[PDB]
């Protein structure tokens, strides 16, 4: 995975939007397209709808999801069996 010395990867367009909301308290579901960014502890308690390819799937970030990539919690291709 990512090199430990470089550190976690996060886009500014989401970092600014989450650091504003931390103090703003606007817990309305945010919207984002960057599913390649890690999850920081400050995000916990917010609802973010991430672009899976067609629409935005909402996810409520919890404590157990920190080191996991954000995109892991949004299915990309629909499948229900044959």
């Amino acid at each position: 995975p990512r090199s430990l010395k470089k550190g976690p990867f996060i886009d500014l367009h989401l970092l600014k939007k989450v650091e504003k909301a931390v103090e703003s308290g606007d817990k309305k579901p945010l919207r984002t397209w960057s599913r390649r960014s890690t999850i920081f502890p400050n995000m916990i308690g917010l609802t973010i709808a991430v672009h899976n390819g067609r629409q935005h799937v909402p996810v409520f970030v919890t404590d157990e999801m920190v080191g996991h990539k954000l995109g892991e919690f949004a299915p990309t291709r629909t499948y229900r069996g044959h």
Binding site: T62, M65, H68, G71, E72, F73
Partner: protein
């Protein structure tokens, strides 16, 4: 010849015998033998009891069958409850590290089953 609650064969060498435990391999067996001052050409038999006692003491430094499986099960259940892609693949019974499901996925799919 009983270590960590399980029995160990006596006709095999120490390195092979220690690998019979769930969580001990060649490296973790040679390290224990080097720490306890026990050679590798000897078997489980032809040994005293203090050597086995210190072998158990050195093995206790690691994670073994009792706690090894608990940690694995807890991690799998945590992934499944979180709902990550890896947890969903584990739920569906499919490769989780990233492979092909069109062909050659028998290990996770199970035996062949036609319509």
């Amino acid at each position: 010849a009983r270590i960590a609650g399980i029995n160990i064969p006596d006709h095999k060498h120490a390195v092979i015998a220690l690998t019979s435990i769930y969580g001990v391999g060649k490296t973790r067996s040679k390290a224990i033998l080097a720490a306890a001052g026990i050679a590798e050409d000897v078997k489980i038999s032809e040994l005293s009891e203090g050597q086995i006692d210190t072998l158990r003491d050195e093995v206790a430094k690691f994670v073994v069958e009792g706690d090894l499986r608990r940690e694995i099960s807890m991690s799998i259940k945590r992934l499944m409850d979180l709902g990550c892609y890896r947890g969903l693949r584990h739920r569906r019974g499919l490769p989780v590290r990233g492979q092909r499901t069109k062909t050659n996925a028998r290990t996770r799919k199970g035996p062949r089953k036609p319509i």
